[PDB]
Design a protein around this ligand. Structure first.
Ligand SMILES: O[C@@H]1[C@H](O)[C@@H](O)OC[C@@H]1O
Ligand SMILES: O[C@@H]1[C@H](O)[C@@H](O)OC[C@@H]1O
Ligand SMILES: [Mg+2]
Ligand SMILES: [Mg+2]
Lengths: 1015, 599
């Protein structure tokens, strides 16, 4: 009967015998337990050890498995994904469906998981009432049996499925049997860019309710004009036999104090000609001066709903957290509690590197603390409803949430093939309506979303209007079909740029400033995805934040995205390593496109996370002479846990400091006058640095947490002191092969055939392993490669343009190499041309001047052909013979920083161990650059100038040829790259060129100088 | 397996293996036959004598009946209602459901009609192409077998159900077996005030199509400011294997003259990031000084759609009547061809006193001539989609039509119990979307209606917005929940009075002159039912017509209603007499409330 019907290949059947969707219930039988949120004896977990067998298709499952356990079954932990236990491979795919596209059919080879559990039910649970089973999430579709009898069928992996078990249980030993299919017609609506995994991946529960029960309830809040009076309105429905003595009480608690209360019998007001709902009631509660909920101050009340008899006896109690807040769109702005929001948002997938797609409280709490510590106020559930505990945590800690229906059909052609077909409207409506029914009481949810990347279809308009009519208290957004269709309240583009238009046919991406002002347009704009954080990325982030703050209707956006989706694998020795698409034998796949996070999969930060923290700060600073002006970007709280540390330093050495307590109203300003600063004698730039520090611990931060900072140049004194004249003259020797310069124990040797510095000696100790040579290339970043689908190659990508032009293959030809003795120095002069197939790409002219103090001054002048693609860098590299423990520099740090991602770094004196100067991106690339550097010390060497550098044990060549970090091996000595100039890293997206023109090396002529000496 | 699943008690299953809804097709293999509307050899009727057996419930049907004919079966004419042959009683009820209200369950005593037919299929029909069966209407739900194998399942009594028969037929003698149930979960959405009858009550057909075929097409018209230039826009979709040599031609004829023509290959313009529809094409045809369609002058053109190869060979042809007219609401008035309508309308049920709910051409034509002879210009399909021939006649003679989805839940408490529940949204959406897909090419249809007397629910808002977005060329109306909700373009009250207010709680009936001027109100008002014509009635009719003519935004209404729903019975001598509720032993019933006609 079951394999005869094939319900998993029919988009018209999405469930059989499944109960109605509702808010989370615990069915307390005591009002005190309900109020204080203690565990309920009526809600039992079945998480733990189940029996499991894997089969290649549903026609291979033996009939006996409904009766009794198979011999060849294993014991597994539930919840779990079965691919994390090695039963088949997980599949990483972006756009292309992991099955043949033939809707609504799936392959006959449909891997099947058979789970089973033997459990005991108490006698009291069967005598009266109703027992249900709840699956919080099963991927993708499943049939359920109990004691050998068929119960029901479910689809949609991301929302709970409940079945009545009352007529199937018996006292003593019971057995459940769940058959789960990897593919179903539901799979066509779940083409999110993520690992495709399967199983019972969220909790399983039994709930016991009385026969007369609360069957649903919703909470709404309404305010007066200045939010000083509120009405809470509660609607309760009951199921079961209606009686005159039944009553409902709603009470509202703040901590231990009761604040409001209401009682009534059943029977609503007249709705229409036929009457009212006899099984429903509505309570209105007044609250004077309610404390309002926001992400800055998450004030919560507790609401208890009691179903009792007129003589006091309690039948059943339910409860929820209530936050009082009003969200609306008024005159083109999104307002919370009457004030315009600025969204500091991120997209977040449910991902764990060991457990796959199974979440736990500990990982959820860790993510929320890191988000808040980095100045995020908002999170988007990309792209499906989350675990139900997630919303409770966001209510309590304070994050705004965008809740998203589980619909994505990215791989259809065209994208709206299913969302414009009326036969799919039944399947899409279940995904949207069940989400609204489960989550509408959470105060943190502030926006509903209709899903992601599904084109624009008539089904989207229908469902947009369904939500506006059942839940008018929250805006609806949807990005598909050009981000501004009739199915969205907010214009919500993905990866639109600040200044530049991208004029694609049908679905153009205007620049965000131009979009606001198109004829007719009146909505607010919030980017649902921007600044794609794949590998070494977030260049140009400051440019978005400048525009968000300048334009009132640009109200922010959500970064893509929070956490890298890598998995763990083991080698022969049992050492763990991070794995991406293709690493499991999965084919076809999309390679490293699954790693786009601000943090590594184990929740360690990438260097881009600090750039996001600075750009999203809640204090803004201006300096005018001796006065700092501090502006607050908080809407609701006074600055009551903040003090301002200031410091003035001269080229790294501290001169003055101080702390001033901050007292600034929401949106207000405070002037801070600095004491008369010291006038120093010596030459150098003075720098002022301010930091805002939180002196007391919060729910989400330790004591001393730094939340905001800013730096400025003050006075500079230029050095007019001519260097001390030394008695010693360096000695030049000239053979056929070499120029040699001796001075003391020091020696320099220039090879006359190559025209490069080939060796230095201190004593008899050689210092170089490779000669000092020009470099014009970098190991390409993910933004340089510019691929989102591994089958499709862009010829506009930076890496393809550099390869075609011959930058990675260009051979240096020597033009000139001469030596001169001056009065007190030796001068070496070189010229080189870099060629590829006749065409000269670059010319380099250098002078080396070795004086009596032992300092070598290097001067470099470069010409770049105007018609070759702009080079990635202009600098030098060599491999030093020694390996030192520390690196000491004066310049921007301490984290990695690039010309278009350096706003968060501060100028100072930094000291780190060598291994901190390398960023271990899972896919190896150029990494570790420090900009704006004046001085670099490494072992006995010192370099001075105005340059950028990176220092490491891996050549640019090794980083280019190796695909995984765990396969990199340290080379002899240390590789030093010193650059006069370096291209930006991009990151408006990762699948088209995205480096802005002010960060390209397009000037045609370049000049820089260094001094190399021994300290 | 069939009596195990009980698909008729599950509002989530409304069909199994049923084909997509589309405009009427004949599949001509010759452009001249298509143009002149001659009968198609590829469209075969199965109307005539079938075998029939009645059973008290679906568990009483013997297993053998799928294999071979029962001895104790009779010969009956199809289409028919089985209550008009004395197998059980017809039931007249107004508001109260004729079954216990316990949705979605129906009684275990569910009378069942078993129909069967033995027919011959030609050899050429099996060699290539696709053979489908089409049930134009079956009340209320049915399972279908062919040659002993199960084919499919359908619900909604008032729209066609099509099944692919290609893999089930054989050369020579074939047998169909249809099991029809009186009650199903669909019955909860069909509580119209009328006789409750059952059976295969509209035509049955076989259609043969090629494997590469036209699968859908729609026609839209667009005008300049003074209706002197028009663009006709045709969208055609194909099914089957796509090839580079396939072409589509659309030509437009007025009598024997060709007026416009366009040819193109498949492949639309880019829709989004993933591309366009490779299986679709859009032709734009220009027409200078087109003759406009109205109820006063029903000028029609003929549109022929040909699927052919690049070297001229014709695969398949389809056709429809096209009338050029623009309907819109502008500044609070309903305009046709730029002029404000005044609706002289009537509500009309499909009723015959001998045949029950089975219509024929002759009765349809008689009704249209009497309507026009009495100065009616408009008809409302109360309260379900009509027979497909009805629209063709209204196109040709000139009546405006309001087409209505088959949804009415009058006997629920409160009235919106199902229309506000998301679990019923799947069942309601099938009733509305399949109606728009079948009827959107008829020029006489000028307004869509979301059904009747079902309160106001979130499901109505959703479906209102679905229609505005797939078909913006016609207004949507809906009376439930007080006649002026967000799910209506026209304020459309039922039985509001000219001068006197009726101030009911929640759903007041203002006087029609007061309603127009309520703070905020800007829509036109057209009464969807007024002047109830029960017995000796229509007093005060002049008072409505005085107000329609005086106030610009009062644009008329539909009288309730056209024809008395009486049935014929016989006495001892064999003399016929007119019978109403209760006269068949049906109980409870609503007596003479079923006779409200002008005729
Ligand atoms: O696939 C991810 C996201 O779902 C999409 O919308 O943008 C690109 C990103 O990598
Ligand atoms: O029942 C009939 C109609 O369907 C209803 O809307 O008004 C009364 C009339 O007799
Ligand atoms: Mg996608
Ligand atoms: Mg009625």
């Amino acid at each position: 009967v079951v394999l005869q019907r094939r319900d998993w290949e029919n988009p018209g059947v999405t469930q059989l015998n499944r109960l109605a969707a509702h808010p989370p219930f615990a069915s307390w039988r005591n009002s005190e337990e309900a109020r204080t949120d203690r565990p309920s004896q009526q809600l039992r977990s079945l998480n733990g050890e189940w029996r499991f067998a894997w089969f290649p298709a549903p026609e291979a499952v033996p009939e006996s498995w409904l009766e009794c356990d198979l011999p060849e079954a294993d014991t597994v932990v539930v919840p779990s994904n079965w691919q994390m236990h090695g039963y088949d491979a997980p599949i990483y795919t972006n756009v292309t469906y992991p099955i043949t596209v033939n809707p609504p059919f799936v392959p006959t080879e449909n891997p099947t998981g058979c789970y089973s559990l033997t459990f005991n039910v108490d006698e009291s649970w069967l005598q009266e009432g109703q027992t249900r089973i709840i699956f919080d999430g099963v991927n993708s579709a499943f049939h359920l049996w109990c004691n050998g009898r068929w119960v029901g069928y479910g689809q949609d992996s991301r929302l709970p499925s409940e079945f009545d078990l009352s007529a199937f249980l018996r006292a003593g030993e019971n057995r459940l049997a769940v058959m789960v299919l990897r593919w179903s017609d539901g799979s066509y609506l779940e083409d999110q860019d993520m690992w495709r995994m399967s199983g019972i991946f969220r909790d399983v529960s039994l709930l016991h309710k009385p026969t007369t029960q609360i069957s649903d309830f919703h909470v709404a809040t309404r305010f007066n004009d200045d939010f000083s009076r509120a009405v809470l309105e509660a609607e309760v429905q009951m199921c079961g036999e209606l009686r005159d003595y039944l009553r409902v009480t709603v009470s509202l608690w703040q901590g231990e104090t009761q604040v409001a209360s209401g009682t009534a019998p059943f029977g609503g007001e007249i709705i229409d000609e036929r009457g009212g709902y006899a099984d429903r009631v509505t309570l209105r509660l007044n609250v004077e001066n309610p404390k309002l909920w926001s992400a800055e101050i998450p004030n919560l009340y507790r609401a208890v709903v009691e179903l009792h008899t007129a003589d006091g006896t309690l039948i059943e109690a339910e409860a929820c957290d209530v936050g009082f807040r009003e969200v609306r769109i008024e005159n083109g702005l999104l307002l919370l509690n009457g004030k315009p929001l600025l969204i500091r948002g991120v997209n977040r997938h449910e991902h764990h590197p060991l457990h796959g797609q199974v979440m736990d409280e500990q990982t959820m709490v860790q993510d929320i603390l890191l988000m808040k510590q980095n100045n995020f106020n908002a999170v988007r559930c990309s792209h499906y409803p989350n675990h139900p505990l997630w919303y409770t945590l966001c209510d309590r800690y304070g994050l705004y949430v965008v809740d998203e229906a589980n619909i994505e059909t990215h791989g259809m052609v065209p994208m709206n093939r299913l969302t414009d077909d009326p036969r799919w409207l039944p399947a899409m409506s279940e995904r949207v309506t069940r989400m609204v029914q489960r989550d509408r009481n959470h105060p943190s949810v502030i926006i509903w979303s209709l899903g992601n990347e599904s084109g624009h279809g008539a089904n989207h308009d229908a469902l947009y209007r369904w939500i506006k009519s059942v839940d008018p208290s929250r805006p609806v957004q949807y990005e598909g079909g050009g981000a501004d269709t009739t199915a969205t309240d907010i214009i919500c583009p993905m990866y639109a740029r600040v200044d530049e238009d991208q004029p694609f046919p049908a679905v153009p991406k205007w620049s965000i400033k131009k979009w606001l002002s198109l004829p007719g347009e009146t909505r607010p704009l919030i980017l649902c995805e921007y600044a794609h954080a794949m590998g070494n990325s977030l260049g140009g982030f400051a440019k978005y934040w400048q525009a968000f703050r300048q334009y009132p209707r640009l109200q922010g956006g959500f970064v893509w995205d929070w956490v890298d989706q890598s998995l763990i694998k083991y080698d022969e020795n049992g050492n763990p390593w991070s794995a991406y698409g293709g690493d499991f034998g999965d084919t076809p796949n999309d390679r490293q496109f699954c790693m786009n996070g601000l943090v590594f999969a184990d929740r360690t930060p990438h260097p881009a996370l600090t750039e996001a923290k600075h750009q999203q700060q809640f204090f803004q600073f201006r300096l005018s002479g001796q006065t700092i002006e501090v502006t607050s970007e908080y809407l609701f709280r006074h600055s009551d846990n903040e003090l301002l540390h200031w410091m003035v330093a001269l080229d790294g050495k501290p001169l003055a400091s101080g702390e001033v307590p901050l007292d600034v109203a929401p949106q207000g300003k405070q002037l801070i006058e600095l004491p008369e600063l010291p006038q120093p004698e010596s030459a150098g730039q003075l720098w002022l640095t301010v930091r805002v520090v939180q002196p007391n611990a919060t729910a989400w931060s330790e004591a001393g947490h730094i939340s905001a900072w800013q730096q400025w140049r003050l006075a500079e004194n230029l050095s007019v002191t001519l260097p001390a004249a030394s008695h010693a003259i360096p000695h030049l020797t000239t053979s056929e092969m070499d120029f040699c310069i001796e001075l003391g124990n020091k020696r320099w040797q220039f090879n006359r055939q190559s025209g490069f510095l080939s060796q230095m000696w201190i004593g008899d100790k050689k210092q170089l392993l490779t000669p000092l040579r020009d470099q014009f290339t970098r190991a390409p970043l993910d933004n340089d490669i510019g691929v989102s689908e591994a089958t499709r190659i862009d010829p506009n990508a930076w890496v393809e343009r550099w390869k075609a032009a011959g930058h990675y293959q260009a051979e240096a030809a020597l033009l000139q190499c001469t030596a001169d003795t001056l009065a007190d120095a030796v001068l070496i002069t070189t010229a080189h041309a870099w060629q590829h197939q006749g065409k000269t790409l670059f010319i380099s002219r250098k002078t080396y001047r070795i004086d009596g103090s032992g300092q070598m001054a290097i001067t470099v002048d470069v010409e770049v052909a105007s018609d070759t693609p702009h080079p990635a860098r202009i600098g030098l590299n060599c491999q030093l013979a020694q390996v030192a423990e520390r690196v000491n520099w004066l310049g921007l740090g301490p984290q990695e920083n690039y010309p278009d991602r350096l706003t968060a770094a501060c100028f100072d004196r930094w000291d780190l161990p060598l291994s901190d100067m390398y960023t271990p991106y899972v896919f190896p690339s150029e990494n570790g650059l420090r900009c704006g550097t004046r001085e670099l010390n490494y072992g006995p060497h010192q370099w001075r100038g105005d340059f950028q550098f990176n220092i490491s044990r891996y050549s640019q060549q090794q980083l280019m040829e190796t695909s995984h970090r765990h396969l990199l091996h340290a080379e002899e000595g240390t590789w030093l790259n010193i650059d006069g100039f370096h291209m930006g890293i991009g990151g408006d997206d990762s699948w088209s060129p995205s480096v802005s023109a002010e960060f390209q090396l397009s000037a045609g002529r370049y000049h820089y100088q260094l001094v190399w000496c021994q300290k």
